[PDB]
Structure formats: structure tokens, C-alpha cells
Design a protein around this ligand. Sequence first.
Ligand SMILES: [Cl-]
Ligand SMILES: [Cl-]
Ligand SMILES: [Cl-]
Ligand SMILES: [K+]
Ligand SMILES: [K+]
Ligand SMILES: [K+]
Lengths: 198, 198, 198
Amino acid sequence: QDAVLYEATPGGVAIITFNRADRLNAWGPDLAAGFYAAIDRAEADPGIRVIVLTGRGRGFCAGARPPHFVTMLRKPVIAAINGPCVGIGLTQALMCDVRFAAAGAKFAAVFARRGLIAEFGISWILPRLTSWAVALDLLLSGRTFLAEEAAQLGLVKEVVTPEQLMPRALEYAEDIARYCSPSSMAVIKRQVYGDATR
Amino acid sequence: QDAVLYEATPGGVAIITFNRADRLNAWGPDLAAGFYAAIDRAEADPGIRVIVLTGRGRGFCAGARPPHFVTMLRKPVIAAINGPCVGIGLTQALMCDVRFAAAGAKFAAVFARRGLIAEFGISWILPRLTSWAVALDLLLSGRTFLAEEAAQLGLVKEVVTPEQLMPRALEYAEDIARYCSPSSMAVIKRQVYGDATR
Amino acid sequence: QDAVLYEATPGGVAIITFNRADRLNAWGPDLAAGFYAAIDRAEADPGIRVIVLTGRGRGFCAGARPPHFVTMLRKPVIAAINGPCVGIGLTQALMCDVRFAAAGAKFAAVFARRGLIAEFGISWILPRLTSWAVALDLLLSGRTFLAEEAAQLGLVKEVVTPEQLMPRALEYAEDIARYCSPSSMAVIKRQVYGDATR
Ligand SMILES: [Cl-]
Ligand SMILES: [Cl-]
Ligand SMILES: [Cl-]
Ligand SMILES: [K+]
Ligand SMILES: [K+]
Ligand SMILES: [K+]
């Protein structure tokens, strides 16, 4: 019944799960507070190496701290996009280090004025991950695109079958946990994002 | 006989047409003045929501205000690239918000020194829409690439058949006109381009 | 027996060849000094228009002046990636203007702390050529990807057969040498990289 579930694997992956499936995990203060507390806990636990972020049920996070605070963590966040990824849900996914998506999962850059203007929000991350052209197209049209188009556009690293989504996100996450030390991951995130988050 | 034609649809799309087909709409002072006046008119008319830009005949704009002034408009410009898009014609296309191209249409980043050095010109927009690598390749080689390669490289949103070019550009344009308010479009353009145009 | 071989074609291409095949051309002070001296020589010779960079044997440069000094040359460098491109070898390839790769050639962004933190190194060039997402994935995973994936990701202009690698890199290089004047190439490199190398 908690808004956000928290689970740690033996391999040192914190699994963070949006748990309001009845509303396709639409953003809200319960979901926010669960998310922050869950992230803080993974971030503070030296036994945790990598974070996996996902939504329970049919949707990832469909509509409704700075927007990009995930980019300033010492630890990587892997989004496993199980279904509808819309509005603030797209913004949060794109703030993550790496994204896997289930085949058929729907994306839409649909926003109210407040999301469009928000500093370090979608109008910041989207063109940085893709380009002005992609960002203009997706924002002005508000159109729906699927996991496969998202991958073509570079919004997603890899599309897998729905059944294989979590095994793959977890495989990859323990893979990087073995390959990089904790201070190497922190260095990488800080080096890649750079001066740009400040 | 006007250098640039102007037409407004019932749906609030201003269609701006380069009308010097005999010279494949090669840039010139007549074409410039028509273009500025036509853009100003669409921009000033509160009945106009979106602008569509195209060339009459076999070519879009093949060879020969700041270069990027289209990026600072309150309203989106959709380029419908019907044929040869070269030199300053490529620069103008790339300054537009969204590009559709006819199958087979030729592109070339061929420039004199003046176009290469021009501030906020092709050496600004090209790598921003693609990358240093793409920009270096296209500029140093001056090579010809077709609509399909342009799409792969992210220079074009979508390739359609020549017959379907204008219907598609207009469909998309009235689509965004319904989806976004005028102040939402203005906000989007300002948020996406950001500090970078100043 | 020289660490780096130097050869000039009639067409004004300087061919620079890493010549420590026994260790897959792994970076080292011999290789560095040969490379700098060879580049300086091409750069100073007004008969030289374009530089081609390659590795003798099975590998390009597999593991181990500022990192990006190639980007500040007046003349283009075309990398012909014949085989394993890893660590500092990936950084050097990516500093080049244009990259061709042999089919099957292995790439890996595998680095010690010193390479990850290095200023204007891989954590600078990689996301600029691709994106934060690609850079985060490749750096945090340290994974191996082949020429074909590298091309999809925009790290490579074109994959050719191993037999056709040098003929193609040289064709392209003499092609650009005919198309651009020397001062036009210098202008292009300076315009594309811009304020960013300073
Ligand atoms: Cl490491
Ligand atoms: Cl809106
Ligand atoms: Cl030229
Ligand atoms: K350590
Ligand atoms: K309004
Ligand atoms: K000259």
C-alpha cells in the first residue's frame, strides 16, 4: 500500500517501484515523497551500487527537489519503462542514466505550461538527449510514439519484450556494478553531465 | 510573378512559396525580401497559427536579418523540402522548426567562405542538429546526400513521396495548430532554443 | 622499426601508421612521440592537404599535448579504424574529423580513473559526438561494441570491408583535398569546434 516500493537485490541493486497502478502511476505528492525517500535511502546505503526504477502494472508513469536531481546522484539510475511514459513521467525517465523499454510502450511529451517552462525540466533534457528538431517535433505535436521510435531517436537504449524487461534491466545493472567501482560511477556521472547541471 | 507567394488556409496555416522555379529558387535579394515580408505578415496576423515553407517547381532552394531569425519567431515553421536543398537553402531549411522531405530530394552543404564563417549560419546550426562529426563530413566533402540519408542523420523528420509532401506538411501543421495554443508554441520555441540564439 | 610510420601520397595525403602491431598499438611514450612528430610534419608541410591515421596489423590502438589537439589543427584527420579501438585509442579516434571502420572492428570505452577525469578527454568528446545517454551507457558498462553499432550510434561515418578500408579512407581524403582549399578546411574546423576547444 506504500506509494513507492523499495527492494534490494543480493547484488546491490535497489529496485524502486511506483505503486499506484490504478492511475497508471500518474505523478502526485505521495509518489514524489516515496520516490525521494527511496532514492535517498539507496544513495545513503553503501551496500547499494545501482538503482533500478520501474512502475507496477500496465504503466510506467503517465502524466500527473529540482527535475534533474537524479543526474546529480553519485549512483546510476536505470529506468525500466514497462508501459505508458507521459508528461512528468517522460521527464523523470529521461533524467535517468540509462533506459530500457518494453516493446509497445507508449511515450508522449504532453505538458501543461508549467512543465514546458520548468527549469532543468523536459525543455532542458529532451533536446540535450536528442536535438532541437526532435524536441520541437515532440513538444509542438504532443504526439504518441512507441518504444521502437524512441530507440531510433536515441531516447531509449534498447527495446525488449515485456517479460524480459526487468531481467535485462537487472542484468545490465549488476553488470555495471561489477565493472565500475562506486567512486568510478560517481566520477563518470559528474564528468558526463559536467558544468551543465549547475 | 512575385518572388515569394503567400497563402492562408482556413485552418490558420500560412503557406510561403519560393517562386523563382526557373533558377531552382536560388537565393537572391528578390527572394529574401519576399521571404522576410511574407514571414512578417504571418507573424503579425493573429489568425495565423503555423507557417509552411516550400519551393515551386523542381527545387526547394539550390544555392545563391541574421541567418537564424526564423528560430526567434513566436510561431513554428515547417519546411516541406520538394527538391534540391543546397547552400543557403540548406541553412534556411535547418533554421525551420520541422522538416519534411520528398523522396529523392538532393541536399548538399556546399558553401563559399562567407557562408562557412557566417555567425549563426550553417556552421552553427548543422553540428547542433547533428554533431561535429556529421558537420565536418558534410562541410569538408561538400557531398550530395538524398532525403533518406538526411533522415538517418536527423536532418529531416520524415521522407514522403513527392505527391504526398504538401498534404503531409499541412496535416502536421494543422495538427499542431489544434494541439498547442499560440502562447504554448511561443514558449516551446523560446524554451528549446534557449539562451543559444542570444 | 619506428613507432609511427609516415608516408605522403602524390595527392597530398599524409598517412600516419601506428607501428607496434605486436601489442595491438597500445598507447605508450614511443607511440605518442612518433604521433606528435608525424602530425607536426604533416601540419607544417604545405604540400600536405589531408591526414589519414591508421594502425598496422590486427589492431587500431587498444588501450595503453592535450587529448584534443587534433581538433585544433588546420588540417583534417581521417581515422581508418582497422581493428580494436579501446581506451585512449577510442579517445584519439574520436578526436579525428572523420572515422571509417573495418567491419567487425571492436570498440570499448574502458578507462582508468585518469582517462575518465582527463580534461578534454573521452568524457568531453563522447557525449558531444553522441549524447549523455550513450556516454553514460558506454562508460559505466565498459561494454564492447562493433563497428556496426558504432555507426548506428554516430561514432563512425561508414563501415567497409577490411580489404576496402584504406582505399576508401584515401578516396575520401583526396576527394576532400580536391573539393576544399587549405584555408577553407582550416575555417571549417575552427567554425565547427568553435569556442568549445578553448
Ligand atoms: Cl573503471
Ligand atoms: Cl500545450
Ligand atoms: Cl569551399
Ligand atoms: K577505488
Ligand atoms: K492560453
Ligand atoms: K584561397
